[PDB]
Symmetry: C3
Subunit: 413 residues, 3 copies
């Protein structure tokens, strides 16, 4: 029946977001850390609060608060459970976040109101480890009595529009201010007792990353390249991008098209500098990578598909939102964004895995709007040569076993 719902009764509880103590000196390029205080029984969400001051004007910022959090390592009992990166967040956002939620995330990560020089704002960078994504995986502190739960952060040294303008330091730039808040759940005795005495097993996810250098060519392009993928465990999907390390989230070539370069379509237009505030694009014409395929033990896991296939279709068929050009996906799961496992590939059972790539023939004059807006599928702007860093990510499952006051991962890979 659709007209008489029977809601179920749950275990009584309470939530409180409690401030953490940050060990170390907060400031650009500094390594700082935190040992989660043992206030509640379980912990869920974790937010990093940053206070920054703008150094330029409209469109001079691009996810500053996000880039600021260069790395985040989650360690339990001295053991590293997972580690995220600056570029992972950007990629995660481009892939799995969407619509108003995604816009809210940008409001939390940078200036989106045309703010000017001197504007000071509060930023919120929500962590995304296994227990930060589902209360069903809430980390049980009351069960990790002899194990310390720690987070290790590394703050970027240069952040465009805050600290620097291109490669020129900005005078007067204020050192950032940081704060760490953790949400705790307080359980009622019944379940609290159960949590500290019984053994537990959690099916959690981890992030795997490998940075590589891209090829380049034009003219007789159709440059090629094979990357040996050294990943392990049952993997849900693969995500990768090609970015110019110089500019934070630049995953596509800079060009003389609106929102594609500093002062595009204008007399001041360049192609060396991006229109920071609008670094991302949906225009497939500005992304390298003509085709791609994955290979298992020397065999095609599937036939070659253009790079647009992994940017549009793979994301359409699963996680149905919209991904900016330059980010690619290949899912082994039916629902890669769902916590419930739905199809995986066990990499720790594959001797050889490879990502075979074929790039487009640059040759397009990035300074010409008519050349960029009016061209062929297999070519892109000569500016593509700057997309030198190839970042490949794999999201896998693992098992976290917690008993007798301590936890540990079932599989060490």
């Amino acid at each position: 029946t659709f007209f008489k719902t029977v809601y179920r009764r749950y275990t009584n509880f309470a939530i409180e977001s409690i401030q953490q103590t940050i060990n170390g000196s907060v400031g650009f390029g500094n390594k700082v850390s935190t040992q989660i205080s043992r206030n509640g029984d379980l912990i869920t969400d974790i937010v990093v609060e940053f206070v920054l001051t703008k150094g330029g004007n409209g469109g001079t910022t691009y996810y500053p608060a996000e880039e600021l959090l260069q790395d985040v390592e989650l360690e339990i009992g001295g053991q590293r459970i997972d580690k995220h990166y600056n570029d992972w967040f950007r990629t995660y956002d481009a892939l799995f976040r969407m619509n108003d939620d995604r816009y809210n995330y940008r409001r939390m990560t940078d200036w989106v109101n045309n703010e000017l020089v001197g504007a000071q704002k509060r930023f919120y960078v929500p962590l995304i480890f296994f227990f930060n994504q589902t209360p069903g995986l809430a980390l049980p502190l009351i069960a990790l009595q002899y194990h310390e739960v720690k987070l290790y952060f590394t703050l970027a040294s240069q952040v465009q529009g805050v600290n620097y303008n291109g490669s020129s330091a900005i005078a007067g730039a204020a050192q950032p201010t940081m704060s760490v808040w953790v949400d705790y759940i307080f359980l009622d005795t019944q379940e609290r007792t159960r949590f500290a005495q019984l053994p537990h097993e959690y099916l959690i996810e981890q992030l795997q990353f490998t940075g590589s250098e891209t090829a380049t060519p034009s003219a007789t392009t159709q440059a090629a390249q094979n990357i040996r993928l050294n990943f392990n465990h049952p993997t849900k999907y693969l995500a990768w991008n090609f970015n110019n390390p110089t500019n934070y989230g630049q995953y596509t070539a800079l060009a003389n098209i609106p929102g594609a370069c500093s002062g595009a379509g204008t007399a001041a237009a360049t192609v060396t500098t991006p229109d920071y505030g609008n670094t991302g694009t949906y225009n497939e014409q500005l992304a390298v990578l003509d085709s791609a395929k994955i290979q298992l033990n020397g065999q095609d896991r599937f036939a070659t598909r253009k790079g647009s296939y992994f940017n549009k279709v793979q994301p359409y068929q699963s996680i149905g939102g919209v991904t900016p050009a330059g980010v690619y996906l290949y899912s082994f799961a039916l629902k890669p964004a769902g916590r419930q496992p739905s199809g995986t590939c066990n990499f720790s059972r594959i001797d050889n895995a490879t990502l075979s790539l074929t790039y487009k023939t640059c040759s397009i004059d990035a300074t010409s709007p008519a050349a960029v807006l009016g061209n062929t599928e297999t070519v892109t702007a000569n500016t593509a040569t700057l997309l030198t860093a190839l970042n490949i990510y794999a999201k896998n499952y693992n098992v976290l076993r917690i008993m007798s006051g301590m936890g540990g991962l079932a599989y060490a890979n």
Copy 2:
């Protein structure tokens, strides 16, 4: 298995939207009502149809059809079950509605096509009581044989862009036309019989509201204020806003910034009048409230967080969409928008509850774009002094017991 779904068979039924009889004289500032006719077995959605005629041009309207429905009281058997308000709808929309659905809601509530003077449109204001939100809570008329189900509406007297322009009545303004439609479900004998003989219990939600006056100060601002919260029952969350009663949904200070005031960035720019069509904003810089915390029996339910935390993070962590600046949320539930209860705080078990507030130091020259777009976290436009009304809402659960032809609420608070 993911490749062989077993759909379940349900109880046969039919839906029909049937027109209601409106008792009383329809017109601005009039109280009118309706006794639901006993056509079907259960009732779900309820829509109020309004026909209005524009009195100005582009951007002169702001959710007219919504504001028109000043109050709505749902009464059963002479007993008031719940009562919503003009400002609740605005707040509900800012918080729980999102994306295309939210845009569709605006299409149903006002002119969004740059329409001019004289444009006449059909508006649809969907009610949002417990049975209007889930067919699982469909109100069982066949079980309320001796109880009358009535709705009591109160129409606003002045609606900007329709009836008035600021405080100046608009000549020729047509009285509104109103219609009430209710969706009925017709059940097959099996279940119909079951519905009229067995006792029933419904876990429903109610709205609680308390209007208060705000503080103000600048210069040596950092004005403070504590509000005693008199709420009852297991509560899912708290939502509140500070608005200038003069302008319908103004939850933020007016300023000389695009979309922030009448003719902003222009020679005609003001700061006394809003850019009606664009009353809402995402810019945290224009909202009062620097920090806030809630207190139970003289103790901090949680540490103080800036007002941006309740506007961005609380909504990000639950109900993941995007909320305009000026609306705040503090959830006791994991999923405040879900009908299924997921965490509550029982206010009828708390002797003292308080909302402790600390405002920002206005001091900013609302007439200066460079002052508004380039400032500090703890200050806002001097225009903030107009946000004098503090509206606090609490959404709670209660039990509706229906038997022997009549219904009633389990807890009278």
Copy 3:
């Protein structure tokens, strides 16, 4: 409990998108087909890849790749299971797709980056038959050993902005390139065995369509018209539109308003030609149809509601997104977009079904912005006379029984 989720273990499997062989000569106006190759055990998604070259500039294209796929027939064992159309996709998109997903779909179907003449892109048109929408209905090839699974496509002859400009062929226009890819699931022995030996039953959906000619009148308009609806089976909903066959997705009247006609609000403005790139609108003022009701065996299935009710409210109450003006919906289901049946009307049990229509009185001067942006609910632009084709669609359920190596539909209607 909300803090200890028990994920369920599933049947091991793998996915691979494999290219299909296209029988027949690919080219505008050609009929081509495909016999699905028997590579895997089950098949899910199916994508048609098209490579087209632009013939004009910004706003000269409107879902080209979508229109290109004029018809698609799914046949099993010589039997036609379902058949979709060009206009069904447009209507499906307007109704059930939404937000970022819907924008991604447009990226897959046409140029959205202001591309110019000569721009060549890769398009992806995802099929939407029963097994293309849910892996739970994956078509079991291993169980259809003696039945051929075939797809029959018909390519449009003229596609605005690619092949033609209005009715003028474009010289040099390249013939399209087409590719068909099917996703297969490879099952492990356990379940594979089970799939090829046990009888199966699938509750699937089909599309029903009937094209009719519209009435027209103005002045003493309020023209009327009744259409005998010849549909069959348990039907989830009805969807219909009035379009000018000349222009692909024109569901509304052309007018001298931004995005409503070629060069609107300009000296070059027309009203004979649409602003192709922006053919759709949300402005109810440009849609015909003043009111409507459905009738069963000579009786009102429900009271008459304005056309805006079926365009805004019906879609708001179910499938909550936003539908462009000109597309209408009347659902018999609680959740028409959900695969799980939730309310249906059995048309093969109704001797007479009728759609009663009443059009608006055109009379509005489509060339006048002040006339279009400032008018009454019961009138529209005189241009409405061009919306001559009435397309009515009904989505129903049926049963696909598969055993002994062959499949067939339970009900032949």
